[PDB]
């Protein structure tokens, strides 16, 4: 019998390459559109007494 | 009320009257027509 010769060791995987950047994350808009209005009307009352 | 040179609503009474079973069956489903009259029970009174 004889001794086993050295095994080939694993290597550290190269790793992940990351690109740096600036992000803006948008979601679906659920907010209603809002604006200003003016109502012009006349309350008309006829009382029968 | 009909004044001189103008007319004015003294009042507008608005009501929802059910269509009776008999009309739904014999008029609406049978021929696609309604009666021009509404006969129904409102405020414990039969009104036409």
Resolution value, angstrom units: 2.2
Which residues of B sit within 8 Å Cβ distance of A?
8-11
Strand bridging mode B40-42 / B45-47 = antiparallel
* B8 contacts: CB under 8 Å, gap ≥ 6: A46, B1
| Separation of alpha carbons A46 and B12, rounded Å | 10
From B1, B29, B5, B33, select the one nearest A46 (Cα to Cα). B1
Sign of dihedral through CA atoms A45, A46, B3, B4? negative
Question: Using an 8 Å Cβ cutoff, are B3 and B10 in contact?
Answer: no
What's the angle, vertex CA B10, arms to CA B8 and CA B3, rounded to 5?
40
From B2, B8, B3, select the one nearest A46 (Cα to Cα). B8
Alpha-helix residue ranges (DSSP H) falling in B1-48? 21-23, 30-31
Going by the DSSP 8-state scheme, the letter that residue B29 receives in this structure is I
User: Which residues of B fall within a CB distance of 8 Å from A48?
Assistant: 10-11
From B45, B29, A17, A10, select the one nearest B17 (Cα to Cα). B45
Query: Which residue of A lies nearest to B11 if distances are taken between CA atoms?
Result: A46
């Amino acid at each position: 019998v004889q001794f086993e010769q050295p095994r080939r060791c694993p290597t550290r995987p190269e790793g992940q390459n990351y690109t740096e950047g600036i992000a803006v994350v948008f979601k679906e808009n659920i907010a209603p559109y809002k604006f200003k209005a003016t109502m012009y009307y006349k309350d008309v009352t006829v009382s029968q007494v | 009320w009909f004044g001189h040179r103008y007319s004015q609503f003294m009042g507008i009474f608005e009501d929802r009257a059910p269509v009776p079973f008999e009309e739904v069956i014999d008029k609406i489903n049978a021929k696609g027509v309604c009666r021009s009259t509404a006969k129904y029970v409102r405020n414990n009174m039969e009104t036409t």
